Scaffold this active site. Structure first.
Site, short mmCIF file in Angstrom:
data_model
loop_
_atom_site.label_atom_id
_atom_site.label_comp_id
_atom_site.label_asym_id
_atom_site.label_seq_id
_atom_site.Cartn_x
_atom_site.Cartn_y
_atom_site.Cartn_z
N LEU A 192 107.80 119.53 59.34
CA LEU A 192 106.35 119.58 59.45
C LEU A 192 105.74 119.76 58.05
O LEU A 192 106.23 120.59 57.28
CB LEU A 192 105.91 120.73 60.36
CG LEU A 192 106.40 120.76 61.82
CD1 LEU A 192 106.11 122.10 62.47
CD2 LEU A 192 105.79 119.62 62.63
N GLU B 94 98.73 127.36 65.14
CA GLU B 94 99.06 126.05 65.71
C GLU B 94 100.33 126.14 66.55
O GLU B 94 100.45 125.49 67.59
CB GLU B 94 99.21 125.00 64.60
CG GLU B 94 98.70 123.61 64.97
CD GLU B 94 99.63 122.86 65.91
OE1 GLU B 94 100.82 122.71 65.58
OE2 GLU B 94 99.15 122.41 66.97
N1 LIG Z 1 103.47 117.52 63.89
C1 LIG Z 1 104.03 117.23 65.06
O1 LIG Z 1 103.38 117.29 66.09
C2 LIG Z 1 105.47 116.80 65.11
C3 LIG Z 1 106.05 116.13 64.03
N2 LIG Z 1 107.34 115.73 64.05
C4 LIG Z 1 107.84 115.03 62.86
O2 LIG Z 1 108.46 113.78 63.18
C5 LIG Z 1 109.37 113.43 62.13
C6 LIG Z 1 110.63 112.80 62.70
O3 LIG Z 1 110.37 111.42 62.99
P1 LIG Z 1 111.32 110.61 64.00
O4 LIG Z 1 112.59 110.28 63.26
O5 LIG Z 1 110.51 109.50 64.64
O6 LIG Z 1 111.65 111.73 65.11
P2 LIG Z 1 112.40 111.40 66.49
O7 LIG Z 1 113.03 112.70 66.93
O8 LIG Z 1 111.44 110.68 67.40
O9 LIG Z 1 113.57 110.38 66.05
C7 LIG Z 1 113.92 109.26 66.84
C8 LIG Z 1 115.33 109.43 67.37
O10 LIG Z 1 115.30 109.68 68.78
C9 LIG Z 1 116.23 108.84 69.47
N3 LIG Z 1 115.52 107.88 70.36
C10 LIG Z 1 114.39 107.20 70.05
N4 LIG Z 1 113.99 106.41 71.08
C11 LIG Z 1 114.87 106.58 72.08
C12 LIG Z 1 115.05 106.04 73.45
N5 LIG Z 1 114.17 105.16 73.97
N6 LIG Z 1 116.11 106.47 74.17
C13 LIG Z 1 116.99 107.36 73.67
N7 LIG Z 1 116.89 107.89 72.43
C14 LIG Z 1 115.88 107.55 71.60
C15 LIG Z 1 117.05 108.11 68.41
O11 LIG Z 1 118.27 108.84 68.22
P3 LIG Z 1 119.67 108.14 67.85
O12 LIG Z 1 119.43 107.46 66.53
O13 LIG Z 1 120.62 109.32 67.78
O14 LIG Z 1 119.95 107.20 69.00
C16 LIG Z 1 116.18 108.18 67.17
O15 LIG Z 1 116.95 108.24 65.96
C17 LIG Z 1 109.69 114.71 61.38
O16 LIG Z 1 109.25 114.55 60.02
C18 LIG Z 1 108.91 115.79 62.10
O17 LIG Z 1 108.30 116.72 61.20
C19 LIG Z 1 108.12 115.99 65.12
C20 LIG Z 1 107.60 116.66 66.23
C21 LIG Z 1 106.27 117.08 66.23
C1 LIG Z 2 103.98 123.77 66.27
C2 LIG Z 2 104.35 122.30 66.02
C3 LIG Z 2 103.80 121.37 67.11
N1 LIG Z 2 102.39 121.30 67.26
C4 LIG Z 2 101.81 120.47 68.23
N2 LIG Z 2 100.49 120.42 68.37
N3 LIG Z 2 102.63 119.70 69.06
C5 LIG Z 2 104.02 119.76 68.91
N4 LIG Z 2 104.79 119.01 69.71
C6 LIG Z 2 104.60 120.59 67.94
C7 LIG Z 2 106.03 120.63 67.82
C8 LIG Z 2 107.25 120.66 67.71
C9 LIG Z 2 108.71 120.68 67.61
C10 LIG Z 2 109.23 121.41 66.37
C11 LIG Z 2 109.62 120.66 65.27
C12 LIG Z 2 110.10 121.29 64.13
O1 LIG Z 2 110.49 120.56 63.03
C13 LIG Z 2 109.62 119.45 62.73
C14 LIG Z 2 110.21 122.69 64.10
C15 LIG Z 2 109.82 123.46 65.21
C16 LIG Z 2 109.93 124.85 65.20
C17 LIG Z 2 110.35 125.52 66.35
C18 LIG Z 2 110.47 126.91 66.37
C19 LIG Z 2 110.19 127.66 65.23
C20 LIG Z 2 109.77 127.00 64.07
C21 LIG Z 2 109.65 125.61 64.05
O2 LIG Z 2 109.56 127.94 63.10
C22 LIG Z 2 110.27 129.10 63.56
O3 LIG Z 2 110.22 129.00 64.99
C23 LIG Z 2 109.34 122.80 66.35
#
Ligand SMILES: NC(=O)C1=CN([C@@H]2O[C@H](COP(=O)(O)OP(=O)(O)OC[C@H]3O[C@@H](n4cnc5c(N)ncnc54)[C@H](OP(=O)(O)O)[C@@H]3O)[C@@H](O)[C@H]2O)C=CC1
Ligand SMILES: CCc1nc(N)nc(N)c1C#CCc1cc(OC)cc(-c2ccc3c(c2)OCO3)c1
Length: 224
Positions: free
Chosen positions: A22, A29
């Site tokens: 993140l 948040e």
């Molecule tokens: N701010 C937020 O709300 C959030 C942000 N993030 C951010 O997202 C970024 C990561 O990006 P990204 O790589 O897209 O994350 P993902 O976890 O979405 O990575 C995709 C992986 O999920 C698997 N996958 C994707 N589609 C499918 C499907 N249809 N069926 C089965 N498996 C699937 C694949 O794994 P494999 O290659 O092993 O098959 C793929 O490598 C991070 O930088 C993180 O900080 C993450 C969560 C929340």
């Molecule tokens: C709080 C982040 C978040 N915000 C919103 N609005 N929607 C979401 N889906 C998420 C999320 C998420 C998954 C996530 C991703 C991650 O790496 C990118 C770290 C955490 C996380 C999970 C637990 C933690 C922590 C970070 O700090 C210590 O406790 C949790």
């Protein structure tokens, strides 16, 4: 069981991540995300959290699997469409097939309230065609704050085609037990309208928003 995508994005580009992490750390948040995904209206129900393989790998190993929530990690390398591997951890190899599996009231026995897609970005893109609602935390850097570098982005285009700003029904949509500070506010920022519940932490002011699916024309229903 409603499919709801939950995400935190930085305006205007809607950046969500950088180098597997993140691009920020905000206590208020996290508090929101945790309570939304944990709390339910039915006390005997639990929500489901679905994530991609890469998102799972960046969650602190102390805090994963996410407590009080059924965890599902989707990777194409896994075996079945849904498989229990550990306590409260499920492995799946298809996002679409996984959703169908949980939705069938035979498997779940009406003990799942909502399926939250905590996503990843590759998952989030595939979620546009799958999720009914979106809980989007629109984050804005304050006048002095520096914009952080990001490499993962939410599809703002695909979102605003299929969804509308339904932030007026946010309090109704969220579980009843959740506590909220501010009140519903409209705000213009870099052109676009930002509507939701306003919170401020560090050098950011962010808005909790709700995005519902747009009304569909009746083109064809499957008759037998
Ligand atoms: N701010 C937020 O709300 C959030 C942000 N993030 C951010 O997202 C970024 C990561 O990006 P990204 O790589 O897209 O994350 P993902 O976890 O979405 O990575 C995709 C992986 O999920 C698997 N996958 C994707 N589609 C499918 C499907 N249809 N069926 C089965 N498996 C699937 C694949 O794994 P494999 O290659 O092993 O098959 C793929 O490598 C991070 O930088 C993180 O900080 C993450 C969560 C929340
Ligand atoms: C709080 C982040 C978040 N915000 C919103 N609005 N929607 C979401 N889906 C998420 C999320 C998420 C998954 C996530 C991703 C991650 O790496 C990118 C770290 C955490 C996380 C999970 C637990 C933690 C922590 C970070 O700090 C210590 O406790 C949790």
């Amino acid at each position: 069981v409603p499919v709801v995508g939950i995400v935190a994005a930085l305006l205007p580009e809607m950046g969500i991540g950088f180098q597997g992490n993140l691009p920020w750390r905000l206590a208020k948040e996290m508090k929101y995300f945790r309570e939304v995904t944990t709390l339910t209206n039915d006390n005997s129900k639990q929500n489901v959290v679905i994530m991609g393989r890469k998102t799972w790998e960046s969650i602190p190993q102390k805090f994963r699997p996410l407590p009080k929530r059924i965890n599902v990690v989707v990777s194409r390398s896994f075996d079945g469409e849904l498989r229990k591997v550990e306590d409260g951890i499920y492995h799946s190899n298809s996002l679409r097939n996984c959703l169908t599996a949980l939705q069938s009231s035979l498997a779940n026995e009406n003990k799942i309230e909502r399926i939250y897609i905590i996503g990843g970005g590759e998952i989030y893109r595939q979620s546009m065609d799958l999720a009914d609602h979106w809980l989007i935390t629109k984050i804005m850097p304050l006048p002095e704050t520096t914009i952080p570098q990001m490499d993962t982005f939410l599809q703002k285009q695909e979102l605003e085609q299929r969804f509308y700003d339904n932030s007026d029904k946010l309090v109704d949509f969220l579980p009843s037990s959740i506590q909220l500070e501010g009140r519903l506010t409209s705000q213009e920022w870099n052109g676009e309208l930002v509507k939701g519940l306003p919170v401020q932490e560090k050098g950011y002011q962010f808005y909790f928003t709700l995005y519902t699916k747009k009304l569909e024309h009746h083109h064809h229903h499957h008759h037998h």
